[PDB]
């Protein structure tokens, strides 16, 4: 039902700050020239990027390649994941390794610091399915959510 948010508050034109400090519509030519001018004058740690929660892989790699060409490595995401130890060197460190369908084969589940009902509702439905049909035992460390 959230698809109706796609019809509201949409960004439809490039915008730059005018002399009064207000965002005003402009052309793609003009907006990119302003951005390109700044990017050509900064290098290294002077340039950084943050990627939000809805960005696609094609956009992520393109931005990383662009910032790498000014020798910047500050490509960040809003969502934290600890970098101590292996960090992101090993995929197994940050994946759901059992897989969603593997929940139906488990015989005990320990949930830690998560409300899967709201963070991943379809994943929580898979747990309930196994709780119902496989008599799965579920334990929770955290707040006692329903």
């Amino acid at each position: 039902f959230a698809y109706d948010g796609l019809k509201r508050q949409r960004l439809t034109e490039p915008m730059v700050r005018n002399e009064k400090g207000l965002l005003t519509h402009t052309t793609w030519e003009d907006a990119l020239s302003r951005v390109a001018g700044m990017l050509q004058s900064f290098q290294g740690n002077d340039v950084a990027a943050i990627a939000g929660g809805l960005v696609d892989a094609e956009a992520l790699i393109a931005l990383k390649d662009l910032l790498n060409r000014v020798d910047s490595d500050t490509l960040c995401t809003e969502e934290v994941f600890p970098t101590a130890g292996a960090g992101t060197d090993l995929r197994s460190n940050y994946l759901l390794n059992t897989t969603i369908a593997g929940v139906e084969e488990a015989d005990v589940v320990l949930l830690v610091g998560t409300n899967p009902r709201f963070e991943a509702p379809l994943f929580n439905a898979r747990i309930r399915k196994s709780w119902l049909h496989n008599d799965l035992k579920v334990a929770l460390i955290g707040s006692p959510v329903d």
Partner: protein
């Protein structure tokens, strides 16, 4: 067998030059080869039997006079039907279309037991009918 004298041709079959399609709608198009998903609003499965080929969606804009949906894409409505995935791929190759194939998604067999509704010691016992 035949009285007609055949020839040997090892070329890959390609008919792009003799189909009359403009260059734009051969090389810049992406064909999608898939078995349509069941419309979740209904239980009938009869529309999931055949393979389909469709093309990448392109711009539609509002007609200034009436607000109708205009298009400049001649392939916007073209949908082809195929018996097998291999037939669909063969058709796309000889026409020079780049394509992606999506494997068919058959529902997995389920274990259904009415008696389970009334289990003595399991959670499948229903609280209502």
């Amino acid at each position: 067998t035949r009285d007609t004298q055949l020839i040997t041709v090892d070329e890959k079959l390609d008919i792009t030059t003799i189909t009359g399609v403009p260059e734009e709608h051969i090389k810049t198009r992406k064909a999608r080869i898939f078995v349509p998903a069941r419309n979740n609003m209904q239980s009938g499965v009869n529309n999931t039997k055949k393979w389909k080929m469709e093309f990448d969606t392109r711009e539609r804009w509002e007609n200034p006079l009436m607000g109708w949906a205009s298009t400049a894409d001649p392939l916007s409505n073209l949908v082809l039907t195929f018996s097998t995935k291999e037939d669909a791929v063969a058709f796309a190759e000889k026409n020079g279309w780049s394509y992606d194939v999506e494997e068919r998604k058959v529902p997995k067999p389920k274990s259904k037991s009415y008696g389970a509704n009334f289990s003595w010691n399991k959670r499948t016992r229903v609280s209502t009918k």
